Design a protein around this ligand. Structure first.
Ligand SMILES: [Zn+2]
Ligand SMILES: [Zn+2]
Ligand SMILES: [Zn+2]
Ligand SMILES: [Zn+2]
Lengths: 1131, 116, 66, 140
DNA sequence: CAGCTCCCTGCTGGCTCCGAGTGGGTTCTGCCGCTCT
RNA sequence: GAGGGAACCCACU
DNA sequence: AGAGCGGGGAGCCAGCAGGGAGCTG
């Protein structure tokens, strides 16, 4: 039974609820880490070459089955214990599991057999385990089991704990591998170039890129050359084909030009043939390539070996890295030249760099695999160095001494802790920001950070193309959620139902293709290629097929029933160019779409009925995937589908747009991400306001996680009374926003009242604020440890007495206990002491290194936690709690980018009131609406008034025909209110009716983290910097403000030269030097004895006092260090 | 129009034009070996500048099965007379000057393509 | 976290009405009728009971440190 | 608050359609809705059967049995459309060999699915990390 | 008058710049093994 | 009554 | 012997290699 249109909204939200019941929101991180742990680590260990060390007896070291434990902690006693995540968070431990490998060492002796020794389960390092993955201790636990462990069942996981810090791996957008991309190089010697970032699948090795370029016109014609890897000059492509073992010309041109009746391809290969005519033999071509390699050879034989290994293992590794694969590599190189000729003729079109069919997403899996590949190569290097150092002189080596277990452990820990991704010794060339501290400010921050993508493009680039909202981001990437400022359009977020493919083996597809009438490339004449469809599997041309209807239909039928083709395998057919491309690699981003066949959905009422009882049929999303109803479509495959926005598009129209829809959208509001799905009516807002709300819903204040009392976070914000919104979208159920909400439903009058809400400000109700409206707590945690710095410097938690301790900040230690720490319940102030630490120096033996509270931060010690860190030292964390009452200057925002600061607070008797005595909680300016065009704000106020009168929770899903302004207006008029939300407000000061009628209603406001008391700063004088003797940096260091260069220019244009001197000389760094009146160099000046002396002149009577900035003295002394003499001549 | 390449038969390679003044004729003489071959056509190099009027050889008939390509019923086939056709444009750089519709017959095994 | 003692806008006592509201909801009153039975006639109090998220039930699932 | 929303495939049925042309083109837009034609011969049903799919021909031939001997030529129309690389042997009508080829192909598909499923997971062994659970004191 | 000299031009390589001002955070220095008792 | 730098990341106008 | 010391874009400028003219024996 077809789903009738009156049931379709319920049906699509039921199937969406099934998707978010099974998959969840952080599924891509957990899937990538699980596939890294299960498959990638073992592949890296096995694919590493065995260590063959001979001085002599020969030792063969082979690595075998890996073993991974659960995350365990070893204390200083050495006793293992199961490490829970809260213990790792509190004690600053790295939540890692030990990795045990099996090693086999075989001994070979002269005239003697092997000796095989089995070091079973050898410890080689600790892998940091991602939270709530398969190998975490929280896996498989229920909500009660998680609450017994003081964990949050709503906490998504998907992050690591490194030194007690939650780290998220941001996905990185790499270019897709094994795919020929042809671009016209801008202002270069090549008119068109064709590249292939070639990399052999399921093997972590760096990609080897080959370019096949075609030169610019301004010789006879157009020359195709080849920029090979490790060949530093441009080899002509015909010479490469000769070096591959093809002397003839029908061989090369049958590999390149598949149809011989076509003349233009021949007329363009003619200059490339005729420029490389003088080379006619294979080894002559090998010599011609190897003569221009990175390592040339004096011997011709060495050059032949060099060119052979370059063309064997480096030039196109994905098609073949082994011998006898010259025909498949040569067909792929001919395909690259063919695509270059097609694009240069204009017959084919140039590739787009911003198309996410051309881009893969390195998640935690591939990134950690790249790390572990490098670090296991380092470990094997260390083992071979140790064992070679022994077997050079010594009899034998014990292997457990050769295994440097710090390599894997500290390398993974360093890269996950600092975010500099790679090796520490090359940190300047390492990409940063791959690992980030997980944002825990609200739950929306956590989910948005866990679903974040990054373009590895410099943020100073003035080109806009990677920053643009490309058309192919539909349904994969949120169109609204992006940062403002230098990272706009580069840092992105996934949409709600977007899933990133985890990776699959190409093999079963290859056997199926072999037994389904595909003719291999190695067993065909090229003359059959010209009318047959080429088949690519993971970018590898594997054969041709002559019936592409039945092959594509068979492949789609297999994928739709969870057979040989798994669900994430992408199968694109390019009809116009006769190609079938099958991609199984990781990093492809896809989304589920309903399947439409013969203008009818395959999703029928029986599926909805079975999903309605998901708890008691065991029916789920995966059964929909198995039923051939939904289908995962990625970006390249979305270029060949015909989408229906709604099933109403499938209905026959009076002007029929399309009758060949292939798929249909489940709901279009799944193009939005996590933070843009909180916006009510996003389609009624201007898109900059949607982006602004996507930014500011991460800075809102709510309850960031349920177990916030256990956690010692450095900064935490908890709202007193978070409310779920009265006007929600249906996507907000799967973000768990009505369980960890981040705002309050205010009564907002959009009115001009007293002028204090002008230019984005708001007027709050003082009486409402007194009742807990937007009241919150700020938790700040301080950590301190008794670090043992050698034998002398012994820092200890002792309550400091002035009789024995020096170096104090002269503050009272009376609130400290006798264990050196403060205790919970004590009020503290900005000068007070919370940790008393004393270091023993070699009367004042002890120096005071006490931990002081942050300046001007009133609070009460909420918790003190005392533990032992990984090093066995005493370690303490103190959480201080400060109640933040809403105040003038605190930043409040609605869900429509209507941010502002509280400009004034009026009491209840002062704020305007309706005839029922309802005063607004917030008053915003009318002028904040018109140029902003946030009509979603007005509709949210109207719908919230209707929902608060009716008792419902209003639905504001973006694209919903069942909800419109007229329907809400009629509903509001049904409750005795004006239909457009206006009310007759009375002046609170005079009692008189306001002549205009004020638009008032419940609107969901959120309180942002940007409070004024966390930003107010002032200075008279204080700390100066060490080097330049200018004031310090920031309010945390009691620093000064920068009177920068444009302020200097403005004061020049003012003509205020004395104010310019006061700012740039007196109020920054006044100084006096003594300058010789002859040479102009600064002179020695004993001001105690009035002994002024200038060496270099022997001058003692002509010395002058010169007032300068200290930075000018520092500059002039750096210049005299630079062998430059600034001779400051006073005449 | 365009004249194709000529290939040597002995060493499997390209031929090259040459003018033998003994007969004062044109021969395709390979220059890897001693193979020679007289030429049927005197045209050696030929170029097309505004002769891009024939976009139909670049069109393959398979595009009748594309679900994303637009179908019309107002342009019937000349060969088989089917009502359904697919219409598109030529998408080359050498066809930016034109927005001419090219039509391909939707019915199987026909494959007839036309313009206007 | 827990039901506010007073309505923010007006000051009507709503802290004694959360358990009554939940009992009326599990007695299959509609939310509008449950709010009307509790005497919450202004929509400023109806949003106070309607939009409340009672997080304290889930904070009581954690075993007490003190 | 209604949203205006519609699309149009631009361009550039103006046709004198008489009785037989109208009847055949109505059938050419609703082929699949035929249960049983009654006693109609093949010659008048020539065009719409040409623009038809073999599942629909199967349904018609199992509802309109007596027509099969005059449909066989049209099956060659399907055969050279789908099994073009084949010729029938002696005493072979195109309908039954077409259905034999279809059944053989779908059985080959089922056998391939069964073989590749057992010969890739249940037959071989893929190397994977397993739980250690040693609680080794290799790292103290 | 052929070869040499002597100044215009074309090319490639080198070099230097890339908004102002604020909060907050973590992580690193430092990196480990020795020769002497 | 005043004892670190640097790198990086996030955010703000 | 542990404690401690040692080991990307954009745009402008400058030098060198090609011309084309003139010159002298
Ligand atoms: Zn002097
Ligand atoms: Zn020859
Ligand atoms: Zn036709
Ligand atoms: Zn109230």
């Amino acid at each position: 039974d077809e789903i009738t249109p009156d049931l379709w909204q319920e049906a699509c939200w039921i199937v969406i609820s099934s998707y978010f019941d099974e998959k969840g929101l952080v599924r891509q991180q957990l899937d990538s880490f699980d596939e890294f742990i299960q498959m990638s680590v073992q592949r890296i260990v096995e694919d590493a070459p065995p260590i063959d060390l001979q001085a002599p007896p020969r030792y063969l070291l082979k690595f075998e089955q890996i073993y991974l434990s659960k995350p365990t902690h070893w204390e200083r006693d050495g006793a293992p214990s199961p490490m829970m995540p809260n213990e790792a968070r509190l004690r600053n431990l790295t939540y890692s599991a030990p990795l045990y490998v099996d090693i086999t060492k075989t001994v070979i002796k002269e005239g003697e057999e092997q000796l095989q020794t089995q070091h079973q389960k050898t410890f080689i390092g600790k892998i940091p385990i991602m939270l709530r993955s398969t190998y975490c201790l929280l896996n498989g636990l229920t909500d009660r089991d998680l609450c017994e462990l003081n964990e949050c069942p709503l906490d998504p996981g998907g992050y690591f704990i490194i030194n007690g810090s939650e780290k998220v791996l941001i996905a990185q957008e790499k270019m897709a591998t094994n795919t020929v991309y042809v671009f016209a190089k801008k202002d270069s010697k090549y008119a068109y170039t064709g590249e292939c970032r070639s990399c052999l699948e399921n093997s972590s090795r760096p990609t080897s890129t080959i370019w096949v370029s075609m030169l610019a016109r301004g010789a006879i014609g157009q020359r195709i050359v080849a920029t090979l890897p490790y060949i530093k000059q441009e080899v002509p492509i015909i010479i490469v084909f000769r070096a591959l073992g093809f002397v003839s010309d029908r061989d090369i041109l049958e590999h390149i030009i598949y149809d011989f009746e076509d003349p233009e391809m021949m007329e363009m290969v003619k200059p490339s043939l005729d420029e490389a005519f003088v080379i006619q033999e294979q080894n002559v071509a090998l010599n011609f390539i190897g003569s221009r390699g990175a390592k040339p050879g004096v011997t011709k034989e060495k050059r032949i070996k060099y060119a052979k290994e370059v063309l064997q293992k480096e030039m196109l590794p994905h098609v073949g890295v082994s011998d006898f694969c010259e025909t498949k590599k040569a067909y792929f190189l001919g395909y690259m030249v063919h695509r270059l000729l097609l694009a240069a003729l204009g017959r084919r079109e140039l590739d787009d760099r911003d198309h996410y069919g051309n881009k893969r997403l390195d998640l935690a899996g591939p990134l950690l695999a790249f790390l572990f590949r490098g670090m296991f190569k380092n470990l094997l290097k260390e083992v071979r160095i140790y064992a070679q150092k022994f077997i050079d002189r010594g009899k034998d080596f014990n292997l457990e001494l050769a295994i440097k277990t710090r390599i894997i452990s500290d390398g993974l820990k360093y890269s996950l802790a600092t975010g500099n991704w790679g090796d520490q010794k090359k940190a300047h060339q390492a990409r940063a920001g791959v690992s980030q501290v997980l944002n825990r400010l609200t739950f929306a921050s956590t989910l948005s950070h866990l679903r974040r993508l990054n373009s590895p493009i410099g943020r100073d680039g003035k080109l806009a193309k990677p920053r643009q909202l490309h058309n192919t981001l539909w349904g994969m990437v949120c169109p609204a959620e992006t940062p403002e400022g230098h990272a706009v359009g580069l840092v992105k977020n996934l949409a709600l139902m977007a899933y990133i493919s985890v990776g699959s083996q190409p093999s079963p597809i290859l056997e199926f293709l072999e037994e389904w009438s595909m003719e291999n490339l190695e067993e065909i004449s090229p003359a059959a290629i010209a009318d047959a469809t080429k088949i690519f599997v993971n970018g590898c041309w594997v054969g041709i097929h002559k019936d592409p209807e039945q092959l594509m239909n068979t492949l789609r039928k297999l994928r739709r029933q969870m057979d040989i083709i798994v669900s994430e395998v992408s199968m694109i057919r390019d009809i116009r160019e006769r190609e079938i491309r099958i991609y199984t690699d990781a990093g492809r981003i896809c989304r589920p779409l309903l399947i439409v066949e013969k203008q009818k959905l395959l999703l029928k009422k029986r599926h909805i009925d079975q999903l309605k009882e998901r708890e008691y049929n065991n029916y789920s999303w995966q059964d929909l995937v198995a039923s051939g109803v939904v289908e995962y479509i990625d970006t390249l495959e979305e270029e060949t589908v015909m989408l229906a926005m709604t099933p109403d598009d499938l209905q026959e129209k009076e002007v029929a747009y399309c009758s060949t829809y292939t798929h249909c959208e489940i709901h279009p509001s799944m193009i939005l991400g996590v933070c843009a799905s909180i916006i009510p009516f996003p389609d009624h807002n201007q898109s900059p306001r949607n982006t602004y709300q996507s930014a500011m819903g991460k800075q809102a204040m709510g309850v960031y996680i349920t177990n916030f009392h256990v956690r010692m976070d450095t900064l935490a914000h908890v709202l007193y009374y978070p409310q779920k919104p009265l006007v929600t979208t249906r996507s907000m159920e799967y973000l768990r926003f009505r369980e960890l909400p981040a705002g309050i439903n205010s009564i907002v009058a959009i009115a001009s009242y007293t002028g204090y809400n002008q230019e984005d400000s708001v007027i709050m109700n003082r009486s409402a604020v007194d009742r807990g409206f937007f009241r919150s707590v700020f938790y700040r945690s301080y950590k301190e440890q008794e670090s043992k710095k050698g034998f002398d410097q012994e820092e200890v938690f002792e309550k400091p007495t002035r009789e024995t301790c020096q170096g104090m900040r002269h503050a009272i230690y009376d609130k400290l206990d006798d264990d050196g720490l403060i205790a919970p319940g004590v009020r503290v102030s900005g000068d007070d002491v919370i940790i008393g630490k004393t270091v023993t120096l070699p009367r004042y033996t002890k120096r005071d290194c006490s931990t002081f509270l942050r300046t001007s931060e009133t609070g009460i010690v909420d918790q003190v936690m005392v533990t032992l860190n990984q090093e066995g030292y005493k370690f303490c964390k103190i959480r201080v709690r400060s109640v933040r009452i809403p105040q003038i200057g605190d930043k409040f925002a609605s869900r429509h980018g209507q941010k502002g600061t509280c400009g004034i607070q009026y009491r209840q008797e002062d704020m305007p009131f309706t005839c029922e005595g309802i005063t607004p909680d917030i008053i915003i300016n009318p002028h904040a609406i018109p140029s902003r065009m946030t009509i979603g704000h007005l509709i949210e106020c109207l719908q919230g008034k209707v929902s608060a009168n009716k008792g419902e929770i209003g639905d504001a899903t973006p694209f919903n025909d069942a909800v419109n302004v007229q329907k809400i207006s009629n509903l509001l008029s049904d409750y005795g209110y004006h239909l457009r939300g206006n009310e007759v407000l009375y002046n609170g000061f005079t009692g008189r009716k306001i002549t205009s009628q004020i638009f008032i209603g419940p609107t969901y406001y959120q309180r942002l983290k940007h409070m004024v008391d966390d930003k107010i700063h002032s200075r008279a004088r204080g700390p100066i910097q060490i080097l330049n003797r200018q004031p310090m940096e920031g309010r945390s260091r009691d620093g000064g403000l920068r009177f920068g260069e444009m302020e200097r220019d403005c004061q020049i244009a003012h003509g205020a030269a004395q104010f310019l001197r006061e700012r740039l000389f007196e109020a920054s760094d006044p100084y006096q030097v003594h300058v010789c009146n002859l040479c102009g160099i600064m002179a020695i000046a004993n001001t105690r004895t009035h002994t002024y002396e200038c060496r270099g002149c022997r001058n003692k009577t002509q010395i002058s006092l010169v007032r300068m900035p200290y930075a000018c003295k520092l500059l002039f002394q750096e210049l005299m260090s630079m062998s430059i003499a600034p001779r400051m001549m006073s005449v | 129009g365009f004249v194709g390449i000529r290939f040597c038969q002995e060493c499997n390679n390209m031929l090259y034009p040459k003018e033998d003044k003994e007969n004062r004729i044109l021969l395709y003489a390979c220059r890897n070996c001693d193979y020679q071959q007289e030429a049927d056509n005197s045209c050696i190099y030929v170029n097309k500048i505004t002769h891009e009027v024939d976009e139909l050889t670049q069109i393959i008939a398979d595009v009748s099965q594309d679900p994303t390509l637009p179908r019309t019923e107002d342009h019937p086939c000349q060969k088989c007379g089917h009502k359904e056709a697919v219409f598109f444009q030529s998408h080359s750089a050498r066809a930016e000057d034109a927005m001419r519709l090219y039509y391909v017959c939707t019915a199987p095994h026909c494959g007839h393509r036309w313009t206007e | 976290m827990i039901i506010p003692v007073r309505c923010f806008t007006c000051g009507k006592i709503v802290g004694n009405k959360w358990e009554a509201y939940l009992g009326l909801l599990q007695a299959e009153y509609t939310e509008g009728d449950a709010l009307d039975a509790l005497g919450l006639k202004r929509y400023c109090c109806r949003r106070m009971l309607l939009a409340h998220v009672d997080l304290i039930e889930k904070l009581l699932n954690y075993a007490p440190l003190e | 608050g209604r949203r205006m929303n519609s699309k149009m495939q631009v361009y550039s049925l103006p046709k004198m359609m008489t009785l037989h042309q109208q009847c055949i083109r109505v059938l050419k837009n609703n082929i699949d809705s035929i249960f049983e034609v009654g006693g109609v011969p093949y010659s008048v049903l020539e065009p719409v059967l040409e623009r038809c799919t073999p599942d629909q021909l199967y349904r018609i031939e199992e509802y309109n049995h007596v027509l099969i001997e005059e449909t066989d030529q049209l099956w060659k129309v399907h055969c050279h459309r789908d099994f073009k690389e084949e010729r029938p042997e002696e005493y072979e009508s195109w309908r039954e060999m077409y259905l034999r080829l279809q059944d053989a192909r779908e059985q080959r598909l089922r056998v391939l699915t069964k073989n590749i499923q057992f010969a890739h997971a249940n037959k071989p062994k893929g190397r994977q990390a397993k739980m250690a659970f040693v609680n080794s004191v290799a790292k103290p």
